[PDB]
């Protein structure tokens, strides 16, 4: 054994109490398998990049390009349902781009145009920005022409000292008059003798005024959010209370994800009772093996078998021919053998150890089966992934990694089908991929017949 509690043959089939070792020599060390548990699946390149994409064929996707498109990068395929339009209904199996995708889920249009100086555009925008529904093409009037060409409501941001009126609680504490006592009314200087209304024009910064210390004198944004702003929603209990109550109760989720009616996102501004409700809805958008794993499970091959049967003998030769090639794969799958959800990878079998040695050479040199550098590739990535999810997760970085990850999962399986991995500067050599082991220049089945 490893520690030596049991050391001969009498007890040959038992394992050690404190450490696990059942024995017959290290041949076990060369025939046993270990597995790596993948964060977010990836797929076998053996099944995705053979001429007939066995998954492209079975899953009616662009047999060769739709795959490559969603697989390695972020081109999403709406999996189950996505009510909101592009101009046409939800595309059951069609794919879209980041851009348009972006436009969807958050809210139709994003327009942040922030003014150049402190008094020209800051005023045009402010006057028409807070409660006024700004129609498309709202021609803001000062630097050049601030053009707001899209939908519903508007939210501006910071302001200097041209004149302070109707703004949020930021400045309230600055001039102690209104936040300390009820003096905002006398704040209007001299005509009151003959909601926010401040002095004629006394403050010029985005600060806190204990002593003018916590500040930030800068620019003022006027970002038009194309979303519908509700101020006084009411209570109707048919379905679970939607949106909000007058002022007390707020049943809506906070300001990220909340589906009320056909409109599905809800931001919250406790300034005025304002429940910002954006319009897009539950749009299942996925990219990568994740997306295909789903698609693959959902299919009842029997149905597609019978569907292709009809497609096969009835329409003309163009679409029926494609259907015969697509019925081939589906047939065997159902015929005898195993079912098709397995083509996707989430559990990576690891080749035995003694078969990917680590050995002492001359001088004290060492030598290991190239396979091991590839393995580390995957394990490192897979781990960095887990930790990247846990730490917190900014989208770009998670996919970025998922990509690498995928690539890696190819590497051990088969190298070169998509790019060729290299040991560091020394030999621009393809690290023998498990594939290269089987076939290869001088591979396995190959030299299995060259001689022993």
């Amino acid at each position: 054994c490893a520690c030596g509690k049991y050391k001969r043959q009498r007890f040959e089939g038992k394992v050690c109490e404190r450490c696990g070792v059942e024995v017959t020599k290290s041949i076990v060390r060369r025939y046993r398998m270990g597995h790596i548990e993948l964060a977010t699946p990836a797929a076998h390149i053996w099944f995705v990049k053979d001429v007939p994409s066995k998954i492209g064929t079975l899953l009616d996707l662009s047999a060769t390009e739709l795959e490559q498109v969603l697989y390695f990068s972020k081109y999403i395929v709406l999996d189950p349902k996505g009510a909101i339009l592009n101009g046409v209904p939800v595309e059951k199996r069609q794919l879209l781009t980041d851009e348009e995708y972006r436009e969807l889920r958050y809210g139709k249009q994003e327009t942040y145009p922030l003014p150049p100086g402190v008094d020209a555009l800051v005023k045009d925008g402010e006057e028409v920005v807070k409660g006024q529904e700004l129609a498309p093409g709202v021609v803001s009037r000062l630097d050049g022409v601030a053009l707001y060409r899209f939908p519903r409501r508007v939210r501006v941001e910071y302001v200097k000292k041209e004149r302070a009126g109707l703004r949020l609680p930021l400045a309230a504490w600055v001039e102690k008059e209104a936040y300390k006592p009820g003096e905002i009314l006398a704040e209007l200087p001299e005509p009151y003798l003959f909601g926010d209304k401040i002095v004629a024009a006394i403050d010029p910064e985005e600060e806190v005024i204990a002593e003018a210390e916590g500040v930030v004198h800068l620019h003022e944004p006027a970002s038009i959010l194309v979303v519908k702003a509700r101020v006084y929603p009411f209570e109707d209990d048919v379905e679970v209370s939607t949106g909000d109550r007058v002022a007390p109760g707020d049943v809506l989720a906070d300001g990220g994800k909340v589906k009320s009616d056909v409109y599905g996102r809800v931001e919250v501004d406790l300034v005025r009772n304002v429940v910002r409700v954006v319009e897009s809805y539950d749009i299942d958008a996925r990219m990568g093996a994740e997306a295909i794993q789903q698609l693959l499970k959902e299919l009842d091959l029997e149905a597609l078998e019978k569907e292709l049967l009809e497609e096969m003998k009835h329409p003309s030769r163009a679409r029926r021919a494609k259907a015969r090639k697509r019925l081939e794969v589906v047939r065997a799958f159902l015929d005898s053998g195993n079912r098709p959800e397995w083509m996707i990878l989430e559990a990576v079998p690891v080749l035995p150890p003694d078969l990917r040695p680590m050995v002492q050479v001359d001088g004290g040199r060492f030598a290991t089966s190239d396979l091991n550098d590839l393995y580390r590739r995957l394990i490192n990535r897979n781990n960095r992934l887990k930790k990247l999810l846990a730490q917190g997760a900014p989208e770009i970085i998670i996919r970025n990694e998922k990509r690498m990850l995928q690539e890696a999962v190819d590497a051990l399986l088969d190298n070169g089908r998509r790019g060729a991995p290299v040991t560091n500067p020394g030999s621009d050599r393809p690290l023998r991929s498990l594939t290269d082991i089987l076939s290869g220049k001088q591979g396995r089945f190959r030299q299995n017949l060259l001689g022993k």
Binding site: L218, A253, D254, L270, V359, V361, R365, N400, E401, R403
Partner: protein
């Protein structure tokens, strides 16, 4: 197609659409990130729920549905019911504490938002720790993990901006990664710098001798406790391994890993050995006393290599007595019928 370009384009495009303004936007987000903390904690205070739980539930509602909880972290938090229960108590929080809830989420968002904006910063940094032995994307990714680290500790109260702060927290993450993953046989950070200093020194030594320094110079130039045995050792660990699979001789079709022999495995000669040895050792063990013979047979051939602790109840005098008298009768009759003499080894 080709992976570098796509990611570069990917984040550069988003920075291109959202860089963070120098002061305003980083200030803004920062403020929100901190308030989230203060919020979450006060939330743990009133709910009796661990800040870890309050943190994960707000994450789910702002970053992802049941999907992101189920696949990433296996299953301890019920995908629907569990998280929801938690959100309900958050709602129940009247006007006063409800405020922290709404803040926590918005803060969580800001966070994730700032993280996005400062990704060009990472890549710019990561760009220079290139030829260290890590993949540019691996490098950026670790550096990225570093920026996330900085986000947890930055105190906006202390005026300095996130730029200079991220630099450190990123450079730290990168260099570690470089030291931890670069080699196939892991080498501690100290050995790493050690190797850098060793290399650098060999460089200044190459400068004038015209003689690639004998391990004498390196010792000297390096410092206090450096000797020939030390340097010969470090440079031996510095050489990365070789590809067990490598083109050898005339690269026509030669693969290096077939030439190494095997040691544990009993080449036939040894299997035959154990057969006769054990059969003859077994014959002698029986025609004797199963006393001091098995003691020394089992103590030596069964477990580990203790005269006194060798025999059961009978002391040392009977041990040496039968050990040496049986061992010699055994040897001297084995001298007669010579079977063992021809040293099986």
């Amino acid at each position: 197609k080709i992976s570098t370009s796509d990611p570069v384009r990917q984040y550069l495009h988003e920075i291109g659409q959202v860089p963070l303004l120098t002061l305003e936007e980083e200030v803004e987000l920062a403020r929100k990130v901190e308030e989230g903390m203060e919020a979450i904690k006060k939330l743990s205070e009133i709910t009796g729920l661990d800040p870890d739980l309050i943190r994960e539930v707000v994450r789910a509602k702002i970053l992802g549905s049941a999907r992101v909880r189920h696949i990433p972290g296996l299953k301890e938090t019920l995908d629907p019911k569990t998280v929801e229960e938690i959100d309900q108590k958050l709602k129940s929080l009247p006007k006063e504490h409800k405020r922290y809830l709404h803040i926590a989420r918005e803060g969580e968002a800001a966070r994730q938002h700032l993280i996005e904006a400062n990704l060009r910063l990472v890549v710019s940094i990561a760009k220079k720790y290139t030829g260290r032995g890590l993949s540019f994307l691996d490098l950026i990714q670790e550096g990225n993990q570093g920026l996330i680290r900085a986000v947890e500790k930055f105190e906006y109260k202390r005026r300095f901006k996130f730029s200079t702060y991220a630099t450190w927290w990123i450079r730290q993450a990168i260099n570690r990664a470089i030291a931890d993953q670069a080699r196939t046989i892991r080498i501690p950070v100290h050995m790493v710098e050690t190797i850098n200093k060793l290399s650098r020194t060999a460089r200044q030594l190459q400068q004038e001798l015209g003689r690639e320094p004998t391990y004498e110079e390196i010792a000297e130039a390096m410092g206090p406790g450096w000797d020939a045995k030390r340097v010969e050792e470090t440079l031996k660990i510095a050489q990365e391994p070789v590809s067990l699979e490598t083109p050898i001789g005339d690269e026509k079709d030669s693969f290096y890993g077939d030439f190494i022999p095997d040691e544990h495995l009993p080449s036939p000669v040894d299997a035959a050995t154990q057969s006769l040895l054990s059969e003859e050792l077994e014959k002698a063990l029986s025609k004797l006393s199963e006393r001091e013979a098995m003691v020394l047979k089992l103590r030596k051939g069964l477990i580990d290599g203790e005269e006194v602790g060798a025999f059961f109840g009978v002391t040392r005098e009977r041990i040496r007595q039968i050990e040496n008298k049986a061992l010699r009768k055994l040897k001297y009759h084995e001298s007669r019928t010579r079977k063992l003499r021809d040293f099986l080894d």
